[PDB]
Amino acid sequence: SNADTGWLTMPDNDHAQVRATADKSSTGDVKILLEVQLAPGWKTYWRSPGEGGVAPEINWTQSVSDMIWHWPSPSAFDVAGIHTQGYDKEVVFPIELKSVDSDNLNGVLTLSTCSNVCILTDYSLNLDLNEPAPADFEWQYNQAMAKVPVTSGLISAVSSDYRNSQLTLSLQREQGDWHQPNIYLDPPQGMLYGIPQLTAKGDHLSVTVDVTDDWGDAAGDITGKALSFVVTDDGYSRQVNDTIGQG
Numbered sequence: 001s002n003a004d005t006g007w008l009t010m011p012d013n014d015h016a017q018v019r020a021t022a023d024k025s026s027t028g029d030v031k032i033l034l035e036v037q038l039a040p041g042w043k044t045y046w047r048s049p050g051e052g053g054v055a056p057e058i059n060w061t062q063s064v065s066d067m068i069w070h071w072p073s074p075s076a077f078d079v080a081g082i083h084t085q086g087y088d089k090e091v092v093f094p095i096e097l098k099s100v101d102s103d104n105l106n107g108v109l110t111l112s113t114c115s116n117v118c119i120l121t122d123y124s125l126n127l128d129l130n131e132p133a134p135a136d137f138e139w140q141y142n143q144a145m146a147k148v149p150v151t152s153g154l155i156s157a158v159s160s161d162y163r164n165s166q167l168t169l170s171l172q173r174e175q176g177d178w179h180q181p182n183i184y185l186d187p188p189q190g191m192l193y194g195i196p197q198l199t200a201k202g203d204h205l206s207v208t209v210d211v212t213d214d215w216g217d218a219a220g221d222i223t224g225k226a227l228s229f230v231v232t233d234d235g236y237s238r239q240v241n242d243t244i245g246q247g
Contacts, residue, residue, distance in 0.1 A: 159247025
């Protein structure tokens with residue numbers, strides 16, 4: 001009746017349920033909402049999960065082109081002596097696909113969940129795009145998008161420096177003072193970032209991050225590599241894309 005998988009469970013995973021819903025426009029562009037509900041104590045991961053984790057992903061059977069996976073603003077956890085970036089309780093991923101030539105969309109979600117172990121579970125998502133999206137799909141999609149970091153606001157300047165296997169950032173708040181900031185970083189390939197240390201005074205936020213290679217030893221030079229992170233404060237979430245060493 002609708003483009004809606006219903007709530008899916010797998011026999012060997014008693015701590016997650018997932019649901020996908022979708023709408024295909026006349027132009028052939030598909031919007032998908034992937035809802036994930038987690039039992040207490042279980043989390044899933046952000047696109048940069050931290051050491052030991054795996055980002056959730058979907059592999060579609062159909063050829064699709066410009067897939068965009070929008071990542072809701074993440075949280076950080078230090079459970080079981082492990083630093084990770086991800087989501088607890090529940091998360092909804094808005095996804096967009098172009099050039100779906102079929103009225104059917106079939107995919108396999110490899111969902112990563114973590115308590116003190118990272119479990120990988122496959123969910124088969126079967127969507128009939130000839131059926132109407134659920135009645136409140138557009139509202140659900142906008143509610144989900146509202147939680148995704150934006151690429152403007154909150155900060156007015158960024159500089160960074162790297163030396164002695166330590167990344168330092170200086171972030172200027174656009175308006176007002178910092179209150180309770182958080183930062184979530186995407187490490188370059190092969191690199192691990194430690195727990196960010198944040199110090200703020202007035203509109204100035206300083207961040208220091210210890211860096212290592214994939215084996216825990218002092219990292220090589222990452223100057224010139226991508227500096228990508230989300231910074232949050234006062235319920236606002238900003239995605240920054242810059243370069244390590246710029247400024």
